[PDB]
């Protein structure tokens with residue numbers, strides 16, 4: 001860590017993140033100081049992450065095990081959240097929404113093909129640059145936001161799948177379009193009940209095995225599903241078709257990252273450059 005000069009704190013569950021300059025090489029980096037107490041398994045788990053390289057995953061440059069674990073990442077200048085708040089006035093243009101969605105699906109397609117899950121996608125851990133790229137960061141690597149949590153997690157599923165990232169990404173997609181969070185819950189039951197009010201209470205019809213999941217209660221209110229035209233106007237038919245498949249209750253019916261990439265929504269996909277003020 002002596003080789004690095006802290007420029008500024010840029011983020012603070014498990015670990016703080018600093019913009020920092022490599023004292024030798026003048027290299028500017030994000031320097032993550034990880035949740036102190038290293039367990040041997042966590043070291044081999046991060047050594048697996050260093051091999052997981054993709055243009056839509058923030059590059060882990062180095063892991064400094066001394067003695068206090070640091071992770072040195074490629075630096076990116078803004079998160080999606082700040083860009084969304086800076087764009088809240090006319091909204092992010094749809095071409096740029098489509099681009100960001102396609103790229104993150106490509107990152108997820110990659111992660112998932114190697115049986116790596118993110119587990120905690122949100123606007124705060126999606127990082128953007130001046131060239132139109134968007135990148136996954138801060139991989140969930142087993143107050144916190146529940147807003148992008150898949151319903152299987154919230155109902156107590158222990159061995160959940162790659163479909164949790166598709167759910168989260170779908171929530172992020174809707175939020176980019178509408179400029180309002182799709183399920184802004186302030187507790188697990190509120191989060192869950194917000195998902196239920198909008199998409200209807202899941203039963204064995206739409207989600208086989210649901211009534212036997214740990215935190216499922218026969219006594220949950222039974223809400224009727226709302227229209228998707230009510231939920232994400234002004235998303236077009238393709239956009240809404242894709243979103244509905246990313247928000248299927250049954251993790252096994254929820255569209256994969258790979259299948260999603262072939263959806264007609266991306267037919268006219270391009271790569272716009274955003275107007276970013278750094």
Ligand SMILES: Cc1ncc(-c2nc(Nc3ccc(C(=O)N4CC[C@H](N(C)C)C4)cc3)ncc2F)n1C(C)C
Pocket residue numbers: 010011012017030032058073074075076077078079081082124125126127137138
């Ligand atoms: C948790 C984590 N590990 C590694 C990184 C990381 N960050 C950056 N650079 C970066 C991130 C966020 C912002 C940013 O716009 N703000 C963070 C807080 C505030 N927002 C919540 C409104 C704005 C600027 C630069 N680069 C590479 C990384 F690996 N991160 C970030 C997600 C903070």
